[PDB]
Structures are given as C-alpha cells and as structure tokens.
Amino acid sequence: TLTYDDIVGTGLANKCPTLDDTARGAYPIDSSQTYRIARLCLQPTTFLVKEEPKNKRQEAEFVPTKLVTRETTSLDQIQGELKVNSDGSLTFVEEDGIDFQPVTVQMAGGERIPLLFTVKNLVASTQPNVTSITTSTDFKGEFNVPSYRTANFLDPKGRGLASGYDSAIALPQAKEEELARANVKRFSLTKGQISLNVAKVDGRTGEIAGTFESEQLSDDDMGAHEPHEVKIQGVFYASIEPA
Amino acid sequence: SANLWERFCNWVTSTDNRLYVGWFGVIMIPTLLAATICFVIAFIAAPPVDIDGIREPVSGSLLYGNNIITGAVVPSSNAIGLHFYPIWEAASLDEWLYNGGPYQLIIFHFLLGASCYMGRQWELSYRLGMRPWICVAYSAPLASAFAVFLIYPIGQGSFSDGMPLGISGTFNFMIVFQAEHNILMHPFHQLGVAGVFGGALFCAMHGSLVTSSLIRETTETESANYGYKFGQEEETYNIVAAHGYFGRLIFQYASFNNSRSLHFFLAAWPVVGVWFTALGISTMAFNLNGFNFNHSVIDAKGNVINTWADIINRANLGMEVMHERNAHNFPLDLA
Amino acid sequence: LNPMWRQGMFVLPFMARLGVTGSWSGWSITGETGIDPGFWSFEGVALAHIV
Amino acid sequence: LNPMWRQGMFVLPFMARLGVTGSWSGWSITGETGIDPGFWSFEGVALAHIV
Amino acid sequence: ELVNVVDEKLGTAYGEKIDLNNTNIAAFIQYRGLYPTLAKLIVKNAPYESVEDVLNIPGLTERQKQILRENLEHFTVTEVETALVEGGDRYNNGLYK
Amino acid sequence: DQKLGANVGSAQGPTGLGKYLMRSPTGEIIFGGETMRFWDFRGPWLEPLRGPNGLDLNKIKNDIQPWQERRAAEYMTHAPLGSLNSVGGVATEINSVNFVSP
Amino acid sequence: AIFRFLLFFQGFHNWTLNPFHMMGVAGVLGGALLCAIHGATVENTLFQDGEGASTFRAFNPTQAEETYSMVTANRFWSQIFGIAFSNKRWLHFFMLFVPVTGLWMSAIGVVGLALNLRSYDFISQEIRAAEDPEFETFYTKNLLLNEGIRAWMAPQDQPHENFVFPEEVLPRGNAL
Amino acid sequence: AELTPEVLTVPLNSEGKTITLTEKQYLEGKRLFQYACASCHVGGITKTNPSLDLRTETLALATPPRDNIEGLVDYMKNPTTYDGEQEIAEVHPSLRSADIFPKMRNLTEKDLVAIAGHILVEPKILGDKWGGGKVYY
Amino acid sequence: EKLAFYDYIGNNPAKGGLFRTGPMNKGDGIAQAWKGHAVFRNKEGEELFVRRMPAFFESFPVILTDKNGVVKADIPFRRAESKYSFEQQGVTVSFYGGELNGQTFTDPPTVKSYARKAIFGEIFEFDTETLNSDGIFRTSPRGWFTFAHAVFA
Amino acid sequence: EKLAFYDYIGNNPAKGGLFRTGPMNKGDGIAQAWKGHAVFRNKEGEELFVR
Ligand code: CLA
Numbered sequence A: 001t002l003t004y005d006d007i008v009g010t011g012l013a014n015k016c017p018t019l020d021d022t023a024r025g026a027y028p029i030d031s032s033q034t035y036r037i038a039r040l041c042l043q044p045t046t047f048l049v050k051e052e053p054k055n056k057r058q059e060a061e062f063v064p065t066k067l068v069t070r071e072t073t074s075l076d077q078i079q080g081e082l083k084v085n086s087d088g089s090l091t092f093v094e095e096d097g098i099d100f101q102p103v104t105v106q107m108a109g110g111e112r113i114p115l116l117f118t119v120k121n122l123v124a125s126t127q128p129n130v131t132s133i134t135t136s137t138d139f140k141g142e143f144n145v146p147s148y149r150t151a152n153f154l155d156p157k158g159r160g161l162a163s164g165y166d167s168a169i170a171l172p173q174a175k176e177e178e179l180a181r182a183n184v185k186r187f188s189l190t191k192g193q194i195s196l197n198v199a200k201v202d203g204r205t206g207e208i209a210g211t212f213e214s215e216q217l218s219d220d221d222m223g224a225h226e227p228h229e230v231k232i233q234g235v236f237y238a239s240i241e242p243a
Numbered sequence B: 001s002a003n004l005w006e007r008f009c010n011w012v013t014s015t016d017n018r019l020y021v022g023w024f025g026v027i028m029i030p031t032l033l034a035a036t037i038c039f040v041i042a043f044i045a046a047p048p049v050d051i052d053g054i055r056e057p058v059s060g061s062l063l064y065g066n067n068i069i070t071g072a073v074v075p076s077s078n079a080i081g082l083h084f085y086p087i088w089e090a091a092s093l094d095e096w097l098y099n100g101g102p103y104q105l106i107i108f109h110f111l112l113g114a115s116c117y118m119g120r121q122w123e124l125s126y127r128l129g130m131r132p133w134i135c136v137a138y139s140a141p142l143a144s145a146f147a148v149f150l151i152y153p154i155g156q157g158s159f160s161d162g163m164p165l166g167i168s169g170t171f172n173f174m175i176v177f178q179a180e181h182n183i184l185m186h187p188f189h190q191l192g193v194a195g196v197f198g199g200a201l202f203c204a205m206h207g208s209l210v211t212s213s214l215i216r217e218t219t220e221t222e223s224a225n226y227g228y229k230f231g232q233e234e235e236t237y238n239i240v241a242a243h244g245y246f247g248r249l250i251f252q253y254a255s256f257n258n259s260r261s262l263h264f265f266l267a268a269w270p271v272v273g274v275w276f277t278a279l280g281i282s283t284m285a286f287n288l289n290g291f292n293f294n295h296s297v298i299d300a301k302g303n304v305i306n307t308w309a310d311i312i313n314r315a316n317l318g319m320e321v322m323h324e325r326n327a328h329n330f331p332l333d334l335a
Numbered sequence C, D: 001l002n003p004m005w006r007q008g009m010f011v012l013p014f015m016a017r018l019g020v021t022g023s024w025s026g027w028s029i030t031g032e033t034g035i036d037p038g039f040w041s042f043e044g045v046a047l048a049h050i051v
Numbered sequence E: 001e002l003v004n005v006v007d008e009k010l011g012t013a014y015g016e017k018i019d020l021n022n023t024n025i026a027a028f029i030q031y032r033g034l035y036p037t038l039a040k041l042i043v044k045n046a047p048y049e050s051v052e053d054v055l056n057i058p059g060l061t062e063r064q065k066q067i068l069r070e071n072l073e074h075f076t077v078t079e080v081e082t083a084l085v086e087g088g089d090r091y092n093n094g095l096y097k
Numbered sequence F: 001d002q003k004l005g006a007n008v009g010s011a012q013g014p015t016g017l018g019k020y021l022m023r024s025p026t027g028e029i030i031f032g033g034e035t036m037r038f039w040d041f042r043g044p045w046l047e048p049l050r051g052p053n054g055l056d057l058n059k060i061k062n063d064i065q066p067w068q069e070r071r072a073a074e075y076m077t078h079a080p081l082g083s084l085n086s087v088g089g090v091a092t093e094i095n096s097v098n099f100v101s102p
Numbered sequence G: 001a002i003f004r005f006l007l008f009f010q011g012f013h014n015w016t017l018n019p020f021h022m023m024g025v026a027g028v029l030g031g032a033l034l035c036a037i038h039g040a041t042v043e044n045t046l047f048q049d050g051e052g053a054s055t056f057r058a059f060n061p062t063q064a065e066e067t068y069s070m071v072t073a074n075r076f077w078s079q080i081f082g083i084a085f086s087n088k089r090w091l092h093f094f095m096l097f098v099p100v101t102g103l104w105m106s107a108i109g110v111v112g113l114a115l116n117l118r119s120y121d122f123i124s125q126e127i128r129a130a131e132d133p134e135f136e137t138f139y140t141k142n143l144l145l146n147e148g149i150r151a152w153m154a155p156q157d158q159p160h161e162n163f164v165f166p167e168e169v170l171p172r173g174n175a176l
Numbered sequence H: 001a002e003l004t005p006e007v008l009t010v011p012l013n014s015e016g017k018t019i020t021l022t023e024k025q026y027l028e029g030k031r032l033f034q035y036a037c038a039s040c041h042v043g044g045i046t047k048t049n050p051s052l053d054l055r056t057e058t059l060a061l062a063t064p065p066r067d068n069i070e071g072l073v074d075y076m077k078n079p080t081t082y083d084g085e086q087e088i089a090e091v092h093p094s095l096r097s098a099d100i101f102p103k104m105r106n107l108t109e110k111d112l113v114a115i116a117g118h119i120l121v122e123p124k125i126l127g128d129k130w131g132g133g134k135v136y137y
Numbered sequence I: 001e002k003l004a005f006y007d008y009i010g011n012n013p014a015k016g017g018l019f020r021t022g023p024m025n026k027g028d029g030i031a032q033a034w035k036g037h038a039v040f041r042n043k044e045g046e047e048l049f050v051r052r053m054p055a056f057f058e059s060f061p062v063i064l065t066d067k068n069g070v071v072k073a074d075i076p077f078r079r080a081e082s083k084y085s086f087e088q089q090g091v092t093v094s095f096y097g098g099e100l101n102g103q104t105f106t107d108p109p110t111v112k113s114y115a116r117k118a119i120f121g122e123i124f125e126f127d128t129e130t131l132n133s134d135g136i137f138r139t140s141p142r143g144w145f146t147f148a149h150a151v152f153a
Numbered sequence J: 001e002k003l004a005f006y007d008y009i010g011n012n013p014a015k016g017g018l019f020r021t022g023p024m025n026k027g028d029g030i031a032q033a034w035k036g037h038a039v040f041r042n043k044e045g046e047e048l049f050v051r
C-alpha cells in the first residue's frame, strides 16, 4: 500500500487498480446471498469521435483524438448492489460515486470536442446462468447522459437557461428569428451504451478487472449545435463483496 | 590568441559594441528573444485558453477572431494555479496551448530578462565611468511588472489571476481588481497617480520652461533646434532667466535655481510614486485592501446615510457579482 | 470532393510533391489521422523559410 | 418615417432651411408633387458651387 | 419550436406553490417546521404522482404526517423537469443571499 | 448540502465540472469551485478525510467529525481578507467585524 | 466623488476602450517616464565640480559649462536602448509635447462622451457573439462587468429616476 | 429621526407581553453582537448557511418561535434546527458549549438579553437591509 | 404616425457610438410603419407600464409598474425565485391604431417581445434587409454636427 | 466519387476568366456529394445522351 504523498503528482491517482497476471480464477455467487460492488472504477485509454460524413453519405468511422485536458478522466468510487436474477444472471445497479468527468479532446482540424464522460444510473447485466464470474463475463447495459453544462451556465453574452439574459442585448433592434437557437437554451438528456468485459478474476478477495467500451454523445452547448458521437475505450476494476 | 576565454570576456564587456551586450546581457538577450518570439506567435495564432480552469476556453489571438485592442495572450489555467507548467510537462502542444502554457513561458522569460535589463543599466554605467542609480529609476516600472505578473499571482494562489498580455485583458485585470480590493480607496495607489500625474506635470513644466528660455542663435525662418550642437561646452538655455520667470509665477523660494536639485526632483517624484503603486499591488496581493467606509456615517436613529464611498461600493458589487460568471459555486470569493 | 486545387492552393501542392503532407494539428493531405509528420510539416516548412 | 435625418443627410438640411426644397426630378422635401423649383433646386445649388 | 422550459414552468403550478417534484429544498423554509428534517425526506423520496403521496413517505412519525397535512395547500406537483433536478440543483441551485 | 441529502460525489456544477468534488491535473480528488487552485493545502483538520488518492468519498460521507465542521466554519469566516482601516471581509463588506488576519 | 466618476465612465461609456483616452494615458504615463528617465540620466552623468560626495552644492547657478555630460548620456542610451537623444533643445520640447498632446487627445474623447458618442462596442464582435455562444474574448468579458456596474449602481447613483430594480432582474453570476 | 423608546419596544414572550430596552442595552447588545455574532451574522445574514437569516419574520416561523427575547435567549443556550427536531449546540456557539466556543464563556444572562434585543431592534431600524445581503448594501 | 415616430429612442441623438458609421437606418432599419401603441395588462386587468430606457444605458431591464409606480411584473434574470415573471402575472398586450390595431397577444414570448421593445417607446416596423442593418443605434446628423464642431472649436 | 468528380467540366482549367478571382469554390461552390449518373430516356424507352 502507498500513502497520499507516494501518489501526489505522479498521475497514479487517475489509475484504476490492477490485478497480476496470476489472478485469473473465478468468484462464486451464492445466489441466496446478496452481493454489491464496493468499488467500480473506469479508466479511459482512448477517445474516438465519429466524424460527420459531410453531405456525401459514405458511412462514417471513429477517429482518434488528442486529450487536450489532462489526467482527470478516470471514474472511481462507483457503488451499488449486484442483485442476482431469477435466470441466474447478474445485474449491477449504481447508487453513487464519482460517476462523471468532463472531458475535452481535439481533432485533426483542431476542433475541441467537449464531452461529459459518465455512467450515471448504470444498469449493466450479464449472461444468464453465471454461478461463478469467470474471465470475460461480459457486463452490458445503459446509463444516462445529462447535459454537459447545467441550467445555471451562462454564455459569453450572459444568456442562459435557468438564469441570464432573454436575448442578444448587444443588438437591441435586430431580427430575432435568426438568433432564436442561440437565445433559447435547451437542456439535453440522452442514453448511452457500455460493455464491461472481464479479463482478470480473483475469487479469493473477490476483485475483478478488465476492459470496457462505451458510446455516448458529446456536448451540444445548450442545444446550440449538433453533438458528436463518441466512443470510449479503457480499463476497469471492480470490488465485489457480500455485504 | 591571448586566450580565447579572456578574449570572450573582453568582447562581452567591450564598450565598443553598437549595443552593449553585458554579462547581464548574456542572460537578458536569450530570455527576451524567447519571450518576444513566443508572444508574437501566441498573440497571432494561439488557440483559446481555459483561463478559469472551468473548461471555458477564452480566445485572444488575431486568427481566432480578435483584433489588436481585444486580442491578448491568456494567462495559464486556474487548474494549474501556481504549478510550474513548461512544455515538457504536457502530453502534447495541443494540451499546452489549451491550459495557457505560453503565458508562463512569456512572463518568466520577460521578468528574468527585464531584471537583467536593470542589471545591464548598471554595467554600462560602470564601464563608462558614470554614476549608477539610473537602473534604480528603472526599478520602479520593473517592480510594477513584477507585482502584476508575479507577486499578485503568488498572493492569490494562481497565475490565472495575473494580468493578461493584451489591451482589453489589462482592462479586465483593473475592473476586477477594483471590485475585490477597492484600489481607488488605497493610499499606495493614490500616491501612484500622484507620481504619474505629477510626473507628466513636471515633465511639461521643465520641458516648457527650458525650451522657453533658449538662447537665440537661430534665424527667424530656421528651426530653433539647430541652435544646439552635439558636444557643446556651455549651456544652451538661460537657467537664470528660467528661474526668474517661474520664481515670479508662484514665488521665488518656491522655484528651482539649482539644475542638480531640479533633475533630482524630476527623477525622485515619479520613481517614488510608482514605487508605492507597485507596493500597492504587492500589498493587495495578500488582501490588505483600500479603505472601507461602507455604512460609516449613520443618523441618530441608526439609518444609514450614504456617502460617495457607498456609491463606489454599488459599482464594485456590480463588477464582483458579474465577473467570472460560472467560476463560483460558493457565497464568499476567497480566491 | 474538396482537395487543395479546389481551394485555390498554390504553394501547398509544391510542398506535398516532395514529401511534406502533414500538419502539426494532426490532419494530412492523403486524409489520414494519427500520423506524426515530425517537424517538417507545412507549419515547419513555413517556419524555416521565415527564419 | 424616412426623412433626410434618418438617411444620414448632412448638407441637404442646410439647403432646405433657406428655401431650396425641391429637385429637378420632380420630388420635394415636404413631399409634394407637380411643384416647379425653378433653377434653384438641390441640383442647381450643387451645380452652382462646382462652377 | 424552441422554448425555455424554466420560464414555461413558471406559468404552471410551479411558480405558485412548492413543487414537490422540482422546487429547490430551500423553499420549504417559508413554512413552520418543514425545512431541516421533513424537506430532506420530501426531496429524497422520488417524485410524487400527487400531493397527497408525500404522506406515504416511509418512516414518517405521527407528528410529521400531521405537519404535512397542514401544509398540503402550499404544495403542488408537476412533471419532473430535468433542467431543475439535474446536477443536484434541488439541494443547491447556486443561490444565496 | 450533504446533510440535506446531496450526493457530493456525483453532484454536477454549472460548468459540469463538479460542484463539490473534482480532480486535480494529476488525478487526485480535490475540492471544487475556484478552490481548485488550493488543492496543495495540507492541514490537521482536513487530513483525516484524505485518502491515498486524495479526499475519500467514504470518509467524507460519514467520518466527518463535528470539531472539523466548526473548524471549517471558523477558518471560513476568518479568511485573510480585510481593509486598511481593518474591516474584515471583501471590499464590498459592511462595517461590523473589525479584523485583519495577522 | 471622482472615483465614482471613473467607474461611471467605465460602466456606461466603456471609456477605457476609447482610442482618444488611450492616447491620453500614453501621454501621461510616457510623460511620467520622460520625467523620471531624464532626471535620473542627468544626475548620473554629471561632471565632478566639487570635492564632496553630495554633488548638489557643486553646481554653478551662473551658467557656463554643461553640468552634465550630454555626450556620455548619448552613448549610454545608444547602447542599452539603441536610441538616444543628442539635442537638448529637442529633448526638452519633446518633454513638452508628449504630456500636453496626451491630455488634449483625452479631452476630445470626453467631448464625444458629452453626446454619448462613445467607443462602447465592436460590431463585428457582437454579431459573432450573438450567433456563436462559444465565442469569448476579454472584450466580451468587460461588457458583462459594465452591465453589472450599470444595474447595481444606477438606483442610488441616479435618484431622480426613481429606479426600482427587483432582486430577480438584477444580473448576477453563479453563487455571487 | 432618532432612536426613541418607542423603537426599543420589542416582544418579550409569545403571549404578547413586551419589554422596553434602553439606549445602554442597545449599544451593549450591538457591541456584544459584534463580539460573538458578526463573524458569521454580519448584517443579519448567515455566511455558513445563507438559507436562514435573522429577519423577525424568519425567526417567527421558526420552531419554536425565535422572534422574541425568550425565544432568542433560549436559542443562545440550547440552539436547534429550524424545525427544532435536532439540537446543534455542538456546531453552534451556546452556553452549554462554552468550552468549545470560548467567546460564549464571558457572556452572562444580562449579555444574552441584550444580544437578543439587538436582533429584534435592527430590522426595526434598517428594514430590508437587515435581512438581505449585498443587494441592499 | 410622424408624431408617434418622434417618441422613439431610436431617433435620440444621445444614442449611438463614435465608430458606429452610416445613417440611422443602418441601425434599427428603415422605418416602414407604426405597429401601434402597446397597452400591457395582467390577469387582474390592471394596466401596466414599461419603464423607458434612459439614453445613458446601452442595455436596460424590462420592468412593468402600475400608475402608482408599483412593480407588478418584469423579466427575471435568475428564475429560481422570480415573483413577477410575465407567466406568473399573466401579462397580455393589446394594440390600438396602426398595424397591430385591435389585436391582442397572450403567449408569454410574444408579449415579452413587445415589452422588450416598449422600452424604446413607440414600437415600429423596420426594414432591415435593404441596407443590411445590424440592429445597433446610430446618432442623427444633429449629433454628428454637434460633435464635430465641439471638437473643432 | 473522386473518379466521377474528374469527369466534371468545372474542374477543367480551360474554363474560367482572367478576372474571375479566387478558388474554384467561389464559382460552382464547394462540392458536397455526387448526385449520381443521370440516364435520359424518352417515351419509347430509347436512351438519350446529352451533348
Ligand atoms: C493607466 C491608468 C490611467 C491613466 C494614466 C489615465 C490618464 C488620464 N485619464 Mg483616466 N481612467 C483610467 C485609467 C487611466 N487614465 C481608468 C481605468 C478609468 C475608468 C474608466 C479612467 C477614467 C477617466 C475619466 C472619467 C477621466 C479620465 C481622464 C484622464 C486624463 C486627465 C487626468 C488629468 O490630468 O487630470 C487633470 C485635470 C484637470 C482639471 C487639470 C486642472 C486642475 C487644476 C489646474 C489644479 C488646481 C489645483 C489647485 C491650485 C490646488 C487646490 C486644491 C486643494 C485640494 C489643495 C489622463 C489622460 C479625464 C479626461 O480624459 O479628461 C480630459 C476624465 O475625465 N480618466
């Protein structure tokens, strides 16, 4: 174990715990004993942004991006119950934790793509009949993607949703129909997909690890413009305990 | 070769160079060149910077929609605070430009060189056999740069609160400063304007007086300036006629007759005044602000009778309440 | 559908003809990404000449 | 609703203050028609000064 | 068409009474004995399909349910608005003195 | 706010950064707001809440001691802010508290 | 009462953004520079006309030779700054010109403020700021400060208007 | 325009009975209000919890009622939440916690009545200012 | 119409800027018609009045008061605790004479829109297309002459 | 698409004018997509061809 000072500034704090190459066993499920996740953690590795195919529909792919912010990406302290289902499957239901981190990445052109990387209200599920959690025991489910900026946020001209100006006060006698979209703030709420596929188990202490892949929309700037589609790959670590 | 290093030192120290590269110059010249080059490029083509660390990038470069008056080089991020953020501290240049990297590179290089610039103003004076203290006069504008770019950020806990490198950005620095510190109601600032106003006053005083008491050596249709040759023995103006005039303007004993006592006063006044204004910013960097006469005079019942000090407070609230919109989450501004 | 010669580029093609086909910002003439042009990017070339 | 002082007219009013309120083309400052300004119209005044 | 959900919300029951499903917790202070304990319970316990549903909060003592019944006339209920509920704005919407 | 029933860990501020808790540039969990600049602060009252990765969400949730709460309240209401004529607070404050931090 | 006059001009007229004012300060600040730099140059380029260290007494009130080395001052600044005077008559007229010209420019600007013909905005900036909610410069920032100044000051600064601004209409940022 | 005893007449208890303070008590309370309250309660607000102020109306809708001498005085000995369903003397200055809040050690029953009186008289004088914050400054 | 046109702040020489070049029409646009006098009322039927903009102010808030000057309605900045929002007060607007004569509007956006305009005095219909106006006030020849000659003098 | 784009006279250098300044995009506009090959037929079903 390492104290705070042994981590400060090293970047280690933005790193989900890891299991050794050994720990590749299996954790048993009593199915008559409630389980929960004491600590789920998500560490991003890559941020992919699906590019707009221009007007010419030609099918679009995801493109790598540079992390214009720094080591503030990881999700940690996630918690909730891992209820066993009648079909013998497992479903995780998140309660609370650092379930979101605002990320901003740049592209080829130089465009900054801000997103709210999150897993809020996560409902991941596994395969039916899973007496023991083996290596690669896929977790799949949805989560909620709230607006990047919240209600109180004001644009450089003072306009906002829950507060701020009603219109473009700098242009007292201008036509407003054109400025409509920029004056009227909208609060976006969308769904997201994620899949946690195990790679390392440890029946002894009951801590699994592996890799994840999630998809969601980026910031729409209070509904000022269209959001980009984002794909996020990284690694995860979960602490399963009876409780 | 009499000895390479010995020659090198003789070349550096040489008073026969068009521009005196001193020993301070060996540090000045490179640091200033890095500062200037980085600035020019930044001011023109640098991308928007997240100054307040709230993921709200501010564009201040020409190519990104600015003009000379609005354009600026934006201070480093508030997420960085007082941390050292060189290029080799970033995963990429994209990241470095987003977090206001250039700003630190400029201010550190400028302040270092500008200090050496002061050091050189001593050195050349030494090599030429003239008295020093010219550099001491330059210590006042330098101390202001130090206070605005370094001292205030150290005090406030972040370089993001340092004065931006641009016209309008400077205006922002002032307005906000006034809100958080009430600088207009601070003695050190008042001494500053006194030095600056007086400075301009005296600059015009002396200027006019001297140029008005010039000895005639020029034609009616010939520039009065030609009545002076570079490298004269005697004076080109009648200082006794000047004193005679100004002495009657106010009253004799309130007038200078000693050129040396005159020029000392001419140098002392603005330098001392600016010294205090530099100390003002350095003092209000630790939140020892100007006088607070809010709700001082109250009537016999307890009603608050307003003064001009209260009207100033209303303007100050307006600045405070509106500055850094989305940066605050809590009631008191302790940062 | 929108290459250099459609955008009235005159110097840009001469830089690509001899190798320089990338930018410090990430994009490239061939249309690739993730590429590392090194120093000798269009920016790099432009920089050198100015110096 | 659209008089001279809305159209950034600076010289025109000074010509109207002293009598000249018509044009050779038929219209007039007051908004009348069929009027005959004679020679001294805005054109006329402009003409004179040039000469 | 584009509309400001918050300004539109002010034309309903919200903006007239304490909305048990939207209105921020601090609003419960303008009535006797509602704020600390009870308002926490109200907000924490999900939205409500009707005003009276608040009486069904599990654990409520006989006195609490008494207080609630008294202040029901000051309550209403509207659709949960994300803009007003997201970001934990019901516990702190960034407003102070 | 946590006593009012707020989940400090997942609370989203106006900019979408984290009303109460956020991350430092190197990943450590720190306090939110303009206070992101002072994440280098260490103090007796605050340390027992800190973990190996910074502020622990578990200790914050139920290990907060009363003496820390009133300690925080004390130091909050005694920030080194004041005027030359010794009037504690922001330049816009009203006369009442005669104080300027030593 | 003069301090409010400054803050008023900022809030309502955006006086700092006025080119004529800018020339003004350029004249005063630069004039306060010439005052300083010239005073210091002379005192530290003086000839030795006495045997004491306090060289003030060693001055001849009755003209004759130059009390300070004009030739040395020239070579000094020519090597540290690159540019230097070499004509006291021009040097002193310049000390008249700069601050007097400055005050005069600042005057013209105020004359325009009488008709409220201020240098408040940049139209190209506002137009983009309206259409694009992500566009922000230090210029836009400043205007928001003006709005706060105007709103919070007007009631007690212009009593004759009987202003009544409800709390809800007062422009405010977050928390503050 | 003066501090009349007409102004210094504030409600003593819940049953309508009133008490009339003296200019000596007022000043003394005012001084005692700066000594131990102003730190957090400057100008009738609450820095560490802006949701609750010292407005007479706010104190009236408190539980128990704290808009009178008896109310406030009880609060300064055994402080509660706005609903009174919880004692907060551990994180709030009071007589029963003077060991924790040294400022409260000196304070005697005479001091408590003065401070209480101060809170009830100020809004009579200042009005909206006493309640609101920077808006009314 | 002419008489009504003078009661519009967009003709006040004290509005405008030093570098806001061109005629007054490059601003609010070419005046086409008088929309008519706007009378504002609330649910109770009370007639409200829009506080006009002083020349000093580049921007001004929308506030409605009765005859006695009592604030009855406004357009809030912070909605969280708004007491006088047009929605809460059921503010409506009616026009008499002119383009909008005899018509009534009750949908809050439209009402606030005209309330936002009443600030400037009589509401007019402008042609912004033609001269490509930017909607920013400019001063009259009266202003420019005064400025030039005050400086020259 | 790229191949089809070359078979468009708006990329022929022999089109244009001496004072028709700017890029080719100021002319026909920025190419967005290929609408597709157009086949012309008449009532009899015969396929026609555009000169
Ligand atoms: C870098 C900072 C800076 C600087 C250097 C300046 C510089 C200037 N400002 Mg300024 N200003 C600034 C920032 C700055 N501004 C900011 C941030 C604001 C806020 C927006 C303003 C707002 C502002 C306003 C509102 C005005 C100025 C004006 C001026 C100019 C005139 C000052 C002067 O000489 O008064 C001298 C004034 C006189 C009247 C001279 C005559 C005085 C007599 C001769 C003295 C008699 C004294 C008597 C004998 C003694 C008795 C007194 C008794 C107490 C003993 C000057 C060019 C003024 C201007 O432009 O005027 C044209 C003006 O009105 N400023």
Ligand code: CLA
Pocket: C007, C008, C009, C010, J018, J019, J020, J021, J022, J023
């Ligand atoms: C000869 C070399 C050359 C060539 C082939 C090009 C080619 C091009 N340039 Mg270019 N350019 C060049 C040099 C060149 N440039 C130089 C040296 C500069 C620096 C000033 C520029 C600056 C520049 C800019 C700023 C732009 C271009 C653009 C363009 C593109 C549009 C073409 C255009 O507008 O033509 C226009 C051609 C003409 C108008 C022909 C003018 C012929 C004159 C009028 C004849 C004069 C006759 C003379 C007066 C007679 C007197 C003699 C008598 C007394 C005997 C095209 C790819 C544009 C672009 O990027 O497109 C997107 C653009 O915006 N260029």
Ligand code: CLA
Pocket: D007, D008, D009, D010, G101, G105, I018, I019, I020, I021, I022, I023, I140, I141, I144, I145, I146, I148
């Ligand atoms: C002073 C006399 C005067 C006045 C009051 C006007 C008034 C007007 N003119 Mg006009 N004009 C004049 C003389 C005048 N004119 C002259 C002499 C010419 C011939 C060049 C014109 C040519 C002209 C045209 C072509 C047009 C107008 C228009 C207009 C109208 C729009 C106003 C405008 O654009 O202002 C703009 C004002 C400014 C931008 C202010 C400039 C101030 C400068 C920048 C200060 C310079 C400071 C200096 C450099 C400092 C250095 C000194 C330092 C070294 C010490 C307005 C009614 C327009 C119109 O008809 O409206 C529909 C129009 O299109 N004018």
Ligand SMILES: CC(C)=CCC/C(C)=C/CC/C(C)=C/CC/C(C)=C/CC/C(C)=C/CC/C(C)=C/CC/C(C)=C/CC/C(C)=C/CC/C(C)=C/CC1=CC(=O)C(C)=C(C)C1=O
Pocket: B040, B043, B044, B068, B166, B167, G022, G023, G024, G026, G027, G030, G031, G033, G034, G037, G038, G039, G041, G042, G070, G073, G074, G077, G078, G081, G083, G084, G085, G086, G091, G097, G098, G099, G101, G102, G105
């Ligand atoms: C990439 C890009 C675009 C970068 C942009 C960066 C940026 C934002 C730049 C903006 C700059 C900008 C536009 C500035 C605007 C401000 C400005 C130009 C104002 C207008 C000026 C004006 C007409 C106003 C009127 C007032 C006026 C006349 C003031 C003039 C001020 C002035 C020039 C003072 C000179 C001061 C100075 C340093 C003099 C040095 C003289 C000298 C070396 C003396 C030393 C000396 C002393 C002695 O005693 C003796 C004996 C000798 C011998 C001797 O030598």
Ligand SMILES: CCCCCCCCCCCCCCCC(=O)OC[C@H](CO[C@H]1O[C@H](CS(=O)(=O)O)[C@@H](O)[C@H](O)[C@H]1O)OC(=O)CCCCCCCCCCCCCCC
Pocket: B011, B017, B018, B019, B020, B021, B028, B029, B032, B033, B036
């Ligand atoms: C990372 C490390 C980078 C290393 C860089 C490579 C080495 C430096 C190469 C320099 C090449 C450029 C030559 C410049 C010539 C010159 O300056 O004057 C030529 C003169 C003539 O002397 C000189 O010239 C003489 C030869 S001759 O007369 O020129 O032929 C010579 O004999 C004598 O020794 C010499 O003094 O040089 C000097 O007077 C010495 C001072 C030079 C000052 C350097 C610039 C000062 C900058 C200060 C900061 C400014 C900030 C930005 C301003 C916009």
Ligand SMILES: CC1=C(/C=C/C(C)=C/C=C/C(C)=C/C=C/C=C(C)/C=C/C=C(C)/C=C/C2=C(C)CCCC2(C)C)C(C)(C)CCC1
Pocket: B021, B025, B026, B029, B030, B033, B034, B035, B037, B038, B041, B042, B045, B046, B047, B093, B097, B102
């Ligand atoms: C005197 C002397 C000398 C010389 C020296 C020199 C001359 C130096 C120089 C130096 C230099 C000359 C330096 C420079 C530097 C530069 C820099 C440092 C820059 C930087 C920049 C940057 C970093 C940029 C960035 C960016 C931006 C900002 C935006 C756009 C993009 C980019 C990225 C580009 C010798 C040695 C002989 C000896 C001693 C003495």
Ligand SMILES: [Cl-]
Pocket: B172, B176, B322, B323, B324, B325, G141
């Ligand atoms: Cl700001």
